mmCIF file of C-alpha atoms in Angstrom:
data_model
loop_
_atom_site.group_PDB
_atom_site.id
_atom_site.type_symbol
_atom_site.label_atom_id
_atom_site.label_comp_id
_atom_site.label_asym_id
_atom_site.label_seq_id
_atom_site.Cartn_x
_atom_site.Cartn_y
_atom_site.Cartn_z
ATOM 1 C CA UNK A 16 85.155 103.841 76.015
ATOM 2 C CA UNK A 17 86.538 100.883 77.975
ATOM 3 C CA UNK A 18 83.968 98.086 78.099
ATOM 4 C CA UNK A 19 84.004 94.518 79.433
ATOM 5 C CA UNK A 20 80.954 92.644 78.122
ATOM 6 C CA UNK A 21 80.136 89.362 79.863
ATOM 7 C CA UNK A 22 77.932 86.472 78.818
ATOM 8 C CA UNK A 23 77.520 82.769 79.452
ATOM 9 C CA UNK A 24 75.832 82.588 82.828
ATOM 10 C CA UNK A 25 72.842 80.394 83.406
ATOM 11 C CA UNK A 26 71.110 77.689 85.378
ATOM 12 C CA UNK A 27 72.511 74.140 85.642
ATOM 13 C CA UNK A 28 72.406 71.121 87.898
ATOM 14 C CA UNK A 29 75.440 69.928 89.875
ATOM 15 C CA UNK A 30 77.872 68.340 87.462
ATOM 16 C CA UNK A 31 76.859 70.721 84.694
ATOM 17 C CA UNK A 32 79.039 72.951 82.586
ATOM 18 C CA UNK A 33 79.105 76.582 81.496
ATOM 19 C CA UNK A 34 81.510 78.748 79.518
ATOM 20 C CA UNK A 35 81.693 82.415 80.488
ATOM 21 C CA UNK A 36 83.014 84.967 78.018
ATOM 22 C CA UNK A 37 84.189 88.535 78.486
ATOM 23 C CA UNK A 38 84.640 90.683 75.353
ATOM 24 C CA UNK A 39 86.618 93.889 75.774
ATOM 25 C CA UNK A 40 86.557 97.282 74.076
ATOM 26 C CA UNK A 41 88.731 100.369 74.480
ATOM 27 C CA UNK A 42 92.045 98.675 75.291
ATOM 28 C CA UNK A 43 94.011 95.891 73.615
ATOM 29 C CA UNK A 44 94.046 92.552 75.439
ATOM 30 C CA UNK A 45 97.680 91.687 74.743
ATOM 31 C CA UNK A 46 99.050 94.127 77.270
ATOM 32 C CA UNK A 47 97.189 93.021 80.379
ATOM 33 C CA UNK A 48 96.686 90.222 82.849
ATOM 34 C CA UNK A 49 92.984 89.357 83.216
ATOM 35 C CA UNK A 50 91.064 87.717 86.063
ATOM 36 C CA UNK A 51 87.758 86.170 87.081
ATOM 37 C CA UNK A 52 86.263 86.907 90.528
ATOM 38 C CA UNK A 53 82.907 85.910 91.962
ATOM 39 C CA UNK A 54 80.478 87.031 94.659
ATOM 40 C CA UNK A 55 78.464 84.253 96.279
ATOM 41 C CA UNK A 56 75.150 85.132 97.936
ATOM 42 C CA UNK A 57 75.690 87.161 101.079
ATOM 43 C CA UNK A 58 79.480 86.749 100.917
ATOM 44 C CA UNK A 59 82.405 88.932 99.935
ATOM 45 C CA UNK A 60 84.200 88.903 96.594
ATOM 46 C CA UNK A 61 86.408 85.844 96.016
ATOM 47 C CA UNK A 62 89.192 85.483 93.472
ATOM 48 C CA UNK A 63 88.704 82.638 90.981
ATOM 49 C CA UNK A 64 91.585 82.707 88.464
ATOM 50 C CA UNK A 65 94.112 85.009 86.757
ATOM 51 C CA UNK A 66 95.786 84.614 83.360
ATOM 52 C CA UNK A 67 98.949 86.402 82.220
ATOM 53 C CA UNK A 68 98.926 88.691 79.131
ATOM 54 C CA UNK A 69 99.924 86.039 76.559
ATOM 55 C CA UNK A 70 98.433 83.115 78.458
ATOM 56 C CA UNK A 71 101.783 81.590 79.450
ATOM 57 C CA UNK A 72 100.817 81.501 83.156
ATOM 58 C CA UNK A 73 97.473 80.639 84.737
ATOM 59 C CA UNK A 74 96.551 80.707 88.426
ATOM 60 C CA UNK A 75 93.577 79.234 90.254
ATOM 61 C CA UNK A 76 91.865 79.412 93.611
ATOM 62 C CA UNK A 77 92.196 76.076 95.417
ATOM 63 C CA UNK A 78 88.377 75.661 95.359
ATOM 64 C CA UNK A 79 88.228 75.524 91.515
ATOM 65 C CA UNK A 80 91.506 73.802 90.567
ATOM 66 C CA UNK A 81 90.951 70.888 88.212
ATOM 67 C CA UNK A 82 87.374 71.970 87.456
ATOM 68 C CA UNK A 83 87.683 75.458 85.910
ATOM 69 C CA UNK A 84 89.972 76.579 83.093
ATOM 70 C CA UNK A 85 90.830 80.170 82.293
ATOM 71 C CA UNK A 86 91.836 81.013 78.721
ATOM 72 C CA UNK A 87 92.046 84.030 76.427
ATOM 73 C CA UNK A 88 92.112 84.880 72.751
ATOM 74 C CA UNK A 89 94.033 88.127 72.342
ATOM 75 C CA UNK A 90 93.199 88.613 68.676
ATOM 76 C CA UNK A 91 89.506 88.390 69.656
ATOM 77 C CA UNK A 92 89.981 90.585 72.771
ATOM 78 C CA UNK A 93 87.990 87.920 74.676
ATOM 79 C CA UNK A 94 88.564 86.190 78.030
ATOM 80 C CA UNK A 95 87.037 82.810 78.869
ATOM 81 C CA UNK A 96 86.189 80.733 81.931
ATOM 82 C CA UNK A 97 85.344 77.088 81.230
ATOM 83 C CA UNK A 98 83.464 75.711 84.236
ATOM 84 C CA UNK A 99 83.045 71.946 84.601
ATOM 85 C CA UNK A 100 81.868 69.695 87.452
ATOM 86 C CA UNK A 101 79.821 72.598 88.753
ATOM 87 C CA UNK A 102 78.850 72.565 92.430
ATOM 88 C CA UNK A 103 76.045 74.284 94.307
ATOM 89 C CA UNK A 104 78.756 76.261 96.105
ATOM 90 C CA UNK A 105 79.855 77.709 92.742
ATOM 91 C CA UNK A 106 76.569 79.637 92.590
ATOM 92 C CA UNK A 107 77.639 83.268 92.367
ATOM 93 C CA UNK A 108 77.739 86.333 90.147
ATOM 94 C CA UNK A 109 80.940 86.072 88.117
ATOM 95 C CA UNK A 110 82.903 89.149 87.027
ATOM 96 C CA UNK A 111 85.827 89.484 84.690
ATOM 97 C CA UNK A 112 88.521 91.949 85.761
ATOM 98 C CA UNK A 113 90.995 93.942 83.664
ATOM 99 C CA UNK A 114 94.518 94.126 85.020
ATOM 100 C CA UNK A 115 95.931 97.576 85.619
ATOM 101 C CA UNK A 116 99.372 99.146 85.797
ATOM 102 C CA UNK A 117 98.087 101.943 88.062
ATOM 103 C CA UNK A 118 99.404 102.186 91.597
ATOM 104 C CA UNK A 119 95.901 102.725 92.934
ATOM 105 C CA UNK A 120 94.597 99.252 92.056
ATOM 106 C CA UNK A 121 95.799 96.086 90.287
ATOM 107 C CA UNK A 122 92.480 95.854 88.412
ATOM 108 C CA UNK A 123 90.727 98.971 87.112
ATOM 109 C CA UNK A 124 87.690 97.680 85.139
ATOM 110 C CA UNK A 125 85.149 94.904 85.690
ATOM 111 C CA UNK A 126 82.394 93.371 83.622
ATOM 112 C CA UNK A 127 78.743 93.855 84.465
ATOM 113 C CA UNK A 128 78.436 90.337 85.974
ATOM 114 C CA UNK A 129 76.770 87.141 84.832
ATOM 115 C CA UNK A 130 74.815 84.919 87.225
ATOM 116 C CA UNK A 131 75.668 81.236 87.599
ATOM 117 C CA UNK A 132 73.064 79.122 89.409
ATOM 118 C CA UNK A 133 73.885 75.507 90.246
ATOM 119 C CA UNK A 134 70.982 73.756 91.874
ATOM 120 C CA UNK A 135 68.945 70.572 92.319
ATOM 121 C CA UNK B 24 79.172 91.406 108.393
ATOM 122 C CA UNK B 25 80.406 94.159 106.052
ATOM 123 C CA UNK B 26 77.859 96.732 104.869
ATOM 124 C CA UNK B 27 78.362 99.941 102.852
ATOM 125 C CA UNK B 28 75.761 102.615 102.066
ATOM 126 C CA UNK B 29 76.357 105.486 99.639
ATOM 127 C CA UNK B 30 74.508 108.796 99.834
ATOM 128 C CA UNK B 31 74.376 112.062 97.964
ATOM 129 C CA UNK B 32 73.432 111.189 94.401
ATOM 130 C CA UNK B 33 71.057 113.287 92.386
ATOM 131 C CA UNK B 34 70.646 115.323 89.238
ATOM 132 C CA UNK B 35 73.491 117.783 88.531
ATOM 133 C CA UNK B 36 73.772 120.501 85.912
ATOM 134 C CA UNK B 37 76.692 120.178 83.472
ATOM 135 C CA UNK B 38 79.658 121.941 85.025
ATOM 136 C CA UNK B 39 78.273 121.516 88.553
ATOM 137 C CA UNK B 40 79.622 119.951 91.726
ATOM 138 C CA UNK B 41 78.410 117.176 94.016
ATOM 139 C CA UNK B 42 79.763 115.500 97.164
ATOM 140 C CA UNK B 43 79.044 111.801 97.808
ATOM 141 C CA UNK B 44 79.530 109.981 101.068
ATOM 142 C CA UNK B 45 79.713 106.334 102.047
ATOM 143 C CA UNK B 46 79.002 104.978 105.539
ATOM 144 C CA UNK B 47 80.619 101.681 106.498
ATOM 145 C CA UNK B 48 79.938 98.965 109.073
ATOM 146 C CA UNK B 49 81.237 95.552 110.055
ATOM 147 C CA UNK B 50 85.016 96.051 109.834
ATOM 148 C CA UNK B 51 87.758 98.218 111.320
ATOM 149 C CA UNK B 52 87.440 101.055 108.820
ATOM 150 C CA UNK B 53 90.933 102.523 109.343
ATOM 151 C CA UNK B 54 92.429 99.097 108.646
ATOM 152 C CA UNK B 55 91.724 99.189 104.915
ATOM 153 C CA UNK B 56 92.166 101.181 101.776
ATOM 154 C CA UNK B 57 88.813 102.310 100.326
ATOM 155 C CA UNK B 58 87.729 103.126 96.784
ATOM 156 C CA UNK B 59 85.007 104.539 94.551
ATOM 157 C CA UNK B 60 83.942 102.724 91.380
ATOM 158 C CA UNK B 61 81.179 103.644 88.966
ATOM 159 C CA UNK B 62 78.855 102.021 86.447
ATOM 160 C CA UNK B 63 77.781 104.117 83.467
ATOM 161 C CA UNK B 64 74.618 103.174 81.559
ATOM 162 C CA UNK B 65 75.129 99.944 79.634
ATOM 163 C CA UNK B 66 78.606 99.297 80.965
ATOM 164 C CA UNK B 67 80.648 97.456 83.555
ATOM 165 C CA UNK B 68 82.346 98.953 86.596
ATOM 166 C CA UNK B 69 85.107 101.525 86.251
ATOM 167 C CA UNK B 70 87.600 102.178 89.057
ATOM 168 C CA UNK B 71 87.465 105.878 90.017
ATOM 169 C CA UNK B 72 89.755 106.438 93.016
ATOM 170 C CA UNK B 73 91.534 104.765 95.956
ATOM 171 C CA UNK B 74 92.529 106.167 99.340
ATOM 172 C CA UNK B 75 94.954 104.531 101.803
ATOM 173 C CA UNK B 76 93.974 103.611 105.396
ATOM 174 C CA UNK B 77 94.804 106.953 107.034
ATOM 175 C CA UNK B 78 94.433 108.954 103.838
ATOM 176 C CA UNK B 79 98.129 109.603 103.232
ATOM 177 C CA UNK B 80 97.978 108.270 99.654
ATOM 178 C CA UNK B 81 95.305 108.909 97.047
ATOM 179 C CA UNK B 82 94.989 107.651 93.492
ATOM 180 C CA UNK B 83 92.695 108.560 90.617
ATOM 181 C CA UNK B 84 91.626 107.393 87.194
ATOM 182 C CA UNK B 85 92.945 109.746 84.498
ATOM 183 C CA UNK B 86 89.494 110.955 83.462
ATOM 184 C CA UNK B 87 88.692 112.273 86.961
ATOM 185 C CA UNK B 88 92.112 113.275 88.305
ATOM 186 C CA UNK B 89 92.122 116.907 89.383
ATOM 187 C CA UNK B 90 88.391 117.535 89.420
ATOM 188 C CA UNK B 91 87.576 114.657 91.861
ATOM 189 C CA UNK B 92 88.879 114.432 95.443
ATOM 190 C CA UNK B 93 88.608 111.322 97.636
ATOM 191 C CA UNK B 94 88.821 111.685 101.417
ATOM 192 C CA UNK B 95 87.833 109.828 104.557
ATOM 193 C CA UNK B 96 86.899 110.396 108.198
ATOM 194 C CA UNK B 97 87.968 107.302 110.084
ATOM 195 C CA UNK B 98 86.276 108.309 113.332
ATOM 196 C CA UNK B 99 82.875 108.304 111.549
ATOM 197 C CA UNK B 100 83.486 105.231 109.305
ATOM 198 C CA UNK B 101 82.824 107.514 106.311
ATOM 199 C CA UNK B 102 84.325 107.871 102.826
ATOM 200 C CA UNK B 103 83.751 110.950 100.637
ATOM 201 C CA UNK B 104 84.042 111.828 96.953
ATOM 202 C CA UNK B 105 83.942 115.490 95.963
ATOM 203 C CA UNK B 106 83.164 115.824 92.236
ATOM 204 C CA UNK B 107 83.743 119.111 90.386
ATOM 205 C CA UNK B 108 83.050 120.215 86.777
ATOM 206 C CA UNK B 109 80.783 117.265 86.155
ATOM 207 C CA UNK B 110 80.041 116.272 82.566
ATOM 208 C CA UNK B 111 77.774 113.813 80.751
ATOM 209 C CA UNK B 112 80.580 111.237 80.922
ATOM 210 C CA UNK B 113 80.195 111.154 84.718
ATOM 211 C CA UNK B 114 76.578 109.906 84.654
ATOM 212 C CA UNK B 115 76.757 106.608 86.548
ATOM 213 C CA UNK B 116 75.874 104.717 89.686
ATOM 214 C CA UNK B 117 78.697 105.399 92.139
ATOM 215 C CA UNK B 118 79.672 102.644 94.582
ATOM 216 C CA UNK B 119 82.102 102.689 97.457
ATOM 217 C CA UNK B 120 84.271 99.629 97.863
ATOM 218 C CA UNK B 121 86.178 98.177 100.827
ATOM 219 C CA UNK B 122 89.813 97.269 100.247
ATOM 220 C CA UNK B 123 91.051 93.714 100.786
ATOM 221 C CA UNK B 124 94.502 92.218 101.387
ATOM 222 C CA UNK B 125 93.435 88.848 99.916
ATOM 223 C CA UNK B 126 95.092 87.374 96.828
ATOM 224 C CA UNK B 127 93.426 88.560 93.615
ATOM 225 C CA UNK B 128 90.768 90.836 95.169
ATOM 226 C CA UNK B 129 91.882 94.451 95.731
ATOM 227 C CA UNK B 130 88.342 95.108 97.049
ATOM 228 C CA UNK B 131 86.049 92.526 98.670
ATOM 229 C CA UNK B 132 82.746 94.355 99.301
ATOM 230 C CA UNK B 133 80.914 97.233 97.706
ATOM 231 C CA UNK B 134 77.802 99.183 98.461
ATOM 232 C CA UNK B 135 74.287 99.647 97.113
ATOM 233 C CA UNK B 136 75.295 102.580 94.887
ATOM 234 C CA UNK B 137 74.023 106.120 94.485
ATOM 235 C CA UNK B 138 72.928 107.450 91.096
ATOM 236 C CA UNK B 139 74.371 110.665 89.651
ATOM 237 C CA UNK B 140 72.925 112.039 86.414
ATOM 238 C CA UNK B 141 74.493 115.054 84.673
ATOM 239 C CA UNK B 142 72.075 116.875 82.334
#
């Protein structure tokens, strides 16, 4: 019943822009921190950004500061990642992540992934 | 250098049992928590269970607590998931995932997945 539905990936040249979206079902956004993580080809998962439940606080990996913006719309149950000044090294599958209050993990649900290709 | 390979998936009758395993390479296995996550048809990834480095602590999603048991054998770099009383809701690709101590990533690698269908 819990679902995180991603969209927005695509193919761009360096300097391009994309907006990822993550629509949620089966829980209400307001209660939870949300995050974006990404897996670059042949690498391990890397954290991108986290946003607090009401959006008061946002956090960014050093590699995306000033270029990416996380935001959320709690009445829409949707999480966003605005990606500007895209770099080849941003090429990755991007996942949204639902914050959790369980002691077994700080995030207990992830989207299905959307591919971001920055090339040429 | 991290690599994870799940085994044991298959077709299971409703109410049946199945044991999955996960073999790991490229890291000191006993140094990390490990987890199972699963992807049902049409959905994203759902956290299933976590086990601590030596197995002292285990944690479960509410919908599998009790009928699932996570365990590990650190000398063989292997993680296990015993699944009992399986139901249609459990149909999914099951992945094992390596824990991480890095900011914002509780897990940093996960495996190829093994498919379990309950019907």
